[PDB]
């Protein structure tokens, strides 16, 4: 995974965060959205996959 | 760590509770930026009312007041989130340092 | 405090006049005035793209 | 820029994409490594 | 014409709002809340608050005050 | 997007115009019990799929 | 002067930011952080976070972050 | 309406134009303390009453 | 041929919506669910709910649901 600089996060003032929004898409007709984020999901520290 | 208020109890004495049990809201929950004496300073999302509340057993009442806390922005673009890059212009913000005197 | 810079407006030029191709997602207060005897100043809360 | 078809290619899988979305970048005034970029809202969106 | 509370005239000639008819705050020197109006203190399993409001038997301490005086959640009994 | 555990109670968010979205030509807050079915696009939940 | 940060000029003659005057992350060689602001450390009843901004240890580990760096809720501390 | 128990954690919802309304002739967010006690109608919280 | 649902004209000559095909209820008289979709048969890293729904076994009691039937908060332990 990795880190990034968000325009805003926990304490408002723009700050670095292990969780950061890179892109947001909303083309679903159901209005659901798919987020790209600086953290990694479904993988362990060792890199093994786990839900 | 704590705040004090006059209790409803009929002996009329001051009672204390921890400040982490206070909350402020307008639409969603606000962030309590600072507090000093009978003044609370908070950043709140826009809304039509302000609400202060306690979350401490019997002391779980709350108070709301009608106030047009509409969104406002320094500069010339109705930005929602403070921009990461751009010009820096003279703006006025409440100093979170509770020592400052208004 | 940080304030955004709306995308620089492409300018189209023509006989005694200019066309500003504004491109800003947020409401942006464009203003303009002549440097003649009459300022004839104008202001418009432009939104999106417009000419 | 900002008109329909401001980005184009013969097919979505092709690597010969061409576009002119008026991409421009400014100085990184803040310490935090950045690449300030300003451009027209996608012309495909305006046409939509 | 209707009195200022749009409601009944009390014995001294004042008129009072029904919102005060049985509040236990006698608005008039004679009458108002002094005239009979029904109160019953619920079942003997239930708890009762400073103003005489009942609360359900399982909520005598639970974190959410069911009396507006808070009596069913006071550190005096929780 | 925000985690709420331990020291890592951090948040993060960007400006996205996630307006209410619908398909067909009748507005709705929720897909109705029924009446019509039309071709639409949604982000499927099968994480094995690749876009 | 009122140039890149509309704030101050350092001893190298460069435009440098008073917003970036007092923060661990330092700047131009002099005309910068060295004349420190109010960085006074609180009393020993306050927990000290990794940024050195102290906060009351009456809180510390409580499920609600109190430092800007979040140090008060770490399992390394709780 | 939702059962937040966690034991059968579920929720139900329907569309409804549940819009704030106000008896009288002035908009208000909350019943202001002072003014005419105009005639109005409200549901009696006494569950023993019958509609 | 395509018809009412724009789905599949099932073997018995019925325009059945494929939105129900992969559900475990034979929508057509014959076929449909008989053309069985991928019941993965998950390993014990996942728990199995009343619908046969697989969910991560560490969530078998946590106070928040993971299955559509919520069996991952069942009073069988929680
Ligand atoms: Ca009375
Ligand atoms: Ca209670
Ligand atoms: Ca510095
Ligand atoms: Ca804490
Ligand atoms: Ca089926
Ligand atoms: Ca669960």
Curated annotation (Swiss-Prot), chains E, G, I:
Changing residue 62 to A: Complete loss of entry of Semliki virus into the cell. Glycosylated. It is found in: Cell membrane; Membrane, Clathrin-coated pit. Disulfide bonds join 3-15, 10-28, 22-37, 42-54, 49-67, 61-78. It is linked to Cerebellar ataxia, impaired intellectual development, and dysequilibrium syndrome 1: An autosomal recessive, congenital, non-progressive cerebellar ataxia associated with disturbed equilibrium, delayed ambulation, intellectual disability, cerebellar hypoplasia and mild cerebral gyral simplification. Additional features include short stature, strabismus, pes planus and, rarely, seizures. Multifunctional cell surface receptor that binds VLDL and transports it into cells by endocytosis and therefore plays an important role in energy metabolism. Also binds to a wide range of other molecules including Reelin/RELN or apolipoprotein E/APOE-containing ligands as well as clusterin/CLU. In the off-state of the pathway, forms homooligomers or heterooligomers with LRP8. Upon binding to ligands, homooligomers are rearranged to higher order receptor clusters that transmit the extracellular RELN signal to intracellular signaling processes by binding to DAB1. This is Very low-density lipoprotein receptor. The chain holds residues 31 to 108 of 873 of the full protein.
